């Protein structure tokens, strides 16, 4: 009931929007829809949590302030700040069980919950490193679509973060398809692998100038400027990707990424709405994609490709293929096959930094 700070609208907006990240719609406990506000020295700290993870933001206080802490409704406080004129001076003070917000002739009285009731994560770092935003953004964007959504194998509803030599690797799979991306970070690292929950991967993604990472036993921390993200890790046995990657593929196909995408996209229209299976007939320098549905409708596409190997028919969930092609934002695609019952590896024909593995269907 002593906390006081006056900050400019523009110094609160990005922090308020970032900390409100881990916060969901329909919070279990009312305080989880609240942000912890703490004034200590010349710093205002804003924390958001969902118990599994948290987002902290620090704002420098160059104007008079009083130390103290409270929790206040996140969306409501952000909306008040955002609704205020550009450059507005936002004067905040505690008046018992009410937080008062004044700026010009606008006055708001918000209901608070004790700072003492605010939850917090407990740990020590084992692996530490820095990397550019762009490297993280590319590692995440390349694999995130392949994460499971709400699988019973809860460790699949996340992304594996693996360090090896001078590389950071991300892996994501749902048991049907897999994505792996490796990037050199310019630092020698100890071989460590952790599973980051999908809600965290999304939060980590949204906080992307440089980025520093601390990996622990059961936690991961990410510092990006004045923001600190922490998450609990998923305790689980993530599958080994090295074993699902085709060991010795004998068949190699090359095609234009966009022509291949447009062909699968058209064939998809007449594939089964539930199962989405298309057939691939591969033969010397040619690919034929076919699709059909219960209504007996059929699509057929013929393409000129670079292929020398055995002729084979292989069924696929066309959505899994289109997902890969939309991820590879390149000129040419390389497809590596073995037989009709085995996985196919797909990659950029000009880069081996990302690899994608898709398991076939029997149509």
């Amino acid at each position: 009931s002593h906390m006081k700070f006056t900050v400019e609208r523009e110094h609160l907006l990005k922090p308020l929007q970032q900390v409100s990240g881990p916060l969901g719609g329909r919070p279990t406990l009312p305080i989880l829809g609240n942000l912890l506000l703490q004034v200590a020295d010349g710093t205002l700290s804003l924390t958001g949590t969902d118990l599994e993870m948290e987002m902290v933001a620090r704002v420098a206080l160059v104007q008079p302030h009083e130390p103290g802490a409270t929790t206040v409704p996140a969306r409501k406080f952000f909306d008040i700040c955002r609704g205020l004129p550009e450059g507005a001076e936002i004067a905040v003070q505690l008046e018992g069980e009410r937080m008062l917000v004044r700026s010009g002739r606008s006055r708001f009285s918000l209901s608070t919950l004790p700072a003492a009731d605010f939850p917090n994560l407990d740990w020590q770092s084992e692996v530490e490193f820095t990397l550019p935003q762009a490297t993280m953004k590319r590692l995440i964007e390349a694999t995130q679509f392949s994460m499971a959504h709400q699988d019973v194998r809860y460790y699949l509803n996340g992304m594996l973060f693996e360090t090896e030599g001078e590389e950071l690797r991300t892996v994501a799979t749902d048991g049907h398809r897999l994505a792996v991306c490796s990037m050199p970070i310019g630092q020698s690292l100890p071989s460590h692998s952790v599973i980051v929950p999908r809600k965290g991967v999304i939060e980590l993604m949204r906080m992307l100038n440089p980025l520093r990472v601390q990996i622990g036993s059961n936690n991961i921390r990410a510092h990006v400027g004045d923001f600190i993200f922490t998450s609990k890790l998923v305790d689980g046995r993530f599958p080994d990707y090295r074993r699902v990657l085709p060991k010795n593929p004998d068949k190699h196909l090359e095609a234009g990424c966009d022509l291949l995408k447009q062909a699968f996209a058209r064939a998809a229209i007449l594939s089964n709405e539930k199962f989405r299976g298309v057939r691939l007939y591969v033969s010397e320098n040619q690919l034929k994609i076919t699709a059909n549905n219960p209504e007996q409708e059929e699509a057929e596409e013929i393409l000129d490709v670079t292929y020398s190997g055995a002729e084979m028919e292989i069924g696929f969930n066309v959505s899994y293929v289109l997902d890969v092609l939309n991820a590879l934002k390149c000129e040419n695609v390389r497809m590596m096959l073995t037989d009709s019952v085995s996985s196919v590896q797909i990659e950029d024909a000009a880069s081996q930094s990302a690899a994608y593995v898709v398991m076939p269907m029997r149509l």
Binding site: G175, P239, R243, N317
Partner: peptide
């Protein structure tokens, strides 16, 4: 189906 990677 579809087959499983693992």
């Amino acid at each position: 189906x579809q087959a499983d990677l693992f």
